[PDB]
Design an enzyme around this catalytic site. Structure first.
Site, short mmCIF file in Angstrom:
data_model
loop_
_atom_site.label_atom_id
_atom_site.label_comp_id
_atom_site.label_asym_id
_atom_site.label_seq_id
_atom_site.Cartn_x
_atom_site.Cartn_y
_atom_site.Cartn_z
N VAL A 1 71.74 -19.65 -23.90
CA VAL A 1 70.63 -20.33 -24.65
C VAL A 1 70.05 -19.25 -25.44
CG1 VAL A 1 68.35 -20.80 -23.44
CG2 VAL A 1 69.69 -22.40 -24.48
N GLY A 2 69.76 -18.49 -25.77
CA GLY A 2 69.17 -16.97 -26.77
C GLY A 2 69.28 -15.07 -26.15
N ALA B 1 65.46 -9.19 -28.77
CA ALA B 1 65.29 -7.76 -28.41
C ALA B 1 64.54 -7.98 -27.01
CB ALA B 1 64.24 -7.37 -29.86
N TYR B 2 63.85 -8.58 -26.91
CA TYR B 2 62.79 -8.57 -25.91
C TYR B 2 63.75 -8.74 -24.47
CZ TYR B 2 59.75 -4.77 -25.76
OH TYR B 2 59.27 -4.09 -26.28
N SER C 1 66.86 -11.89 -23.05
CA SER C 1 68.62 -12.59 -23.34
C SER C 1 67.78 -14.49 -21.82
CB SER C 1 69.97 -13.06 -22.12
OG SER C 1 70.12 -11.68 -22.71
N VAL C 2 67.87 -15.58 -22.82
CA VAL C 2 67.73 -16.75 -21.44
C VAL C 2 68.93 -17.65 -20.94
CG1 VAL C 2 65.93 -18.83 -21.85
CG2 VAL C 2 65.33 -16.91 -23.21
N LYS D 1 64.62 -16.57 -18.75
CA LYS D 1 64.71 -15.04 -19.21
C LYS D 1 64.42 -13.57 -18.05
CE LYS D 1 61.39 -12.50 -23.10
NZ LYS D 1 60.46 -12.62 -23.72
N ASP E 1 53.94 -18.51 -26.07
CA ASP E 1 54.51 -17.29 -26.94
C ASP E 1 52.63 -16.50 -27.70
OD1 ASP E 1 57.09 -16.98 -26.72
OD2 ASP E 1 57.29 -17.80 -29.14
#
Length: 332
Positions: free
Chosen positions: A28-29, A32-33, A35-36, A51, A161
């Site tokens: 889904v995403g 840099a931090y 993958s989801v 995540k 966030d």
């Protein structure tokens, strides 16, 4: 406390090794931090976001950010704040520990999904209710904006966030030596205005345009005020500009609810020691239909002493591993 059964899969060239409870993982995403993947959580029945942290321990700065993020997520236990559903690692010991996966409710739709005064009372109420909670733990969000606010079909809201500068408090933009939690109230004020009017309040094209837009509304701060909200450099910059009077709000917000306008006057002020707090704001008459003093809870104390510590990578890693191991899932 038994280790779940894990299974492995490679999706979009990423390895996901996850407890069997997490099914139908769908990418889904990425970023840099981490993958989801969206997933079905078979234990709780929930749609979740999983995540996978990207190189969580690659540098000192990375290892510390991983720890910080897990400590924060683990702390938040409030209806209007993203919390941690699960955290896991496929590692069976600290020695094999390299990967961290974080599971939260699957959100999708943010504030900009607005496709009405009563809806704005409810939305702003929920933000302030979450901020009361966050601030009570001495945590400051620092960059609150519509993209960091998830809202479902029933207009129920969560702060996410913990990159636009349209919502950032002046004392942050001016690099003041010190600032307080009410920087987040500035941001709520900019968000409220935009929901009331349907336009960005301070749509600056760059940093200096943003500052000039702000000054035109609120007026130039006097000597003692400017000194406290600005760096030495920025103080001299603002002193070089032509002075501006304060505008009367609601000549600006024509047709918004008069109580809404009143609340904005209390949020959009440069003096952070006079700016209304989340707690005081919740008790403002604008939220009379929503406010309940016995349903606006506060947070357990949050220990941020690690923030001053310079530790080595393995120390950050071990502390992180401790927090994975000690995690106790929320009731559900």
């Amino acid at each position: 406390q038994e280790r779940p059964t894990f299974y492995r899969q490679e999706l979009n060239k990423t390895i996901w090794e996850v407890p069997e409870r997490y099914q139908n993982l769908s990418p889904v995403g990425s970023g840099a931090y981490g993958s989801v993947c969206a997933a079905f959580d078979t234990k709780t029945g929930l749609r979740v976001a999983v995540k996978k942290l990207s190189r969580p321990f690659q540098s000192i700065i990375h290892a510390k950010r991983t720890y910080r993020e897990l400590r924060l997520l683990k702390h938040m236990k409030h209806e209007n704040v993203i919390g941690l559903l699960d955290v896991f690692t496929p590692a069976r010991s600290l020695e094999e520990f390299n990967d961290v996966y974080l599971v939260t409710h699957l959100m999708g739709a943010d504030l900009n999904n607005i496709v009405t005064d009563d809806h704005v009372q409810f939305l702003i109420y929920q933000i302030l209710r979450g901020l009361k909670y966050i601030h009570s733990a001495d945590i400051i969000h620092r960059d609150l904006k519509p993209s960091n606010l998830a809202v479902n079909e029933d207009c129920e809201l969560k702060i996410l966030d913990f990159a636009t500068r349209w919502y950032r408090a002046p004392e942050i933009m001016l690099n003041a030596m010190h600032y307080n939690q009410t920087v987040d109230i500035w941001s709520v004020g900019c968000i409220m205005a935009e929901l009331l009017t349907g336009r960005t309040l301070f749509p600056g094209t760059d940093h200096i345009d943003q500052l000039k837009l702000i000054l035109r509304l609120v007026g130039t701060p006097g000597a003692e005020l400017l000194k406290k909200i600005s760096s030495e450099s920025a103080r001299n910059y603002i002193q070089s500009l032509t002075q501006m009077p304060k505008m009367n709000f609601a000549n600006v917000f024509i047709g918004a609810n008069p109580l809404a306008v009143d609340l904005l006057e209390k949020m959009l002020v440069l003096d952070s020691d006079k700016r209304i707090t989340a707690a005081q704001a919740l008790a403002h008459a604008y939220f009379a239909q929503y406010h309940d003093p016995d349903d606006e809870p506060v947070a357990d104390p949050y220990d941020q002493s690690f923030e001053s510590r310079d530790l080595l990578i393995d120390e950050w890693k071990s502390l992180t591993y401790d927090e994975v191991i000690s995690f106790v899932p929320p009731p559900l």
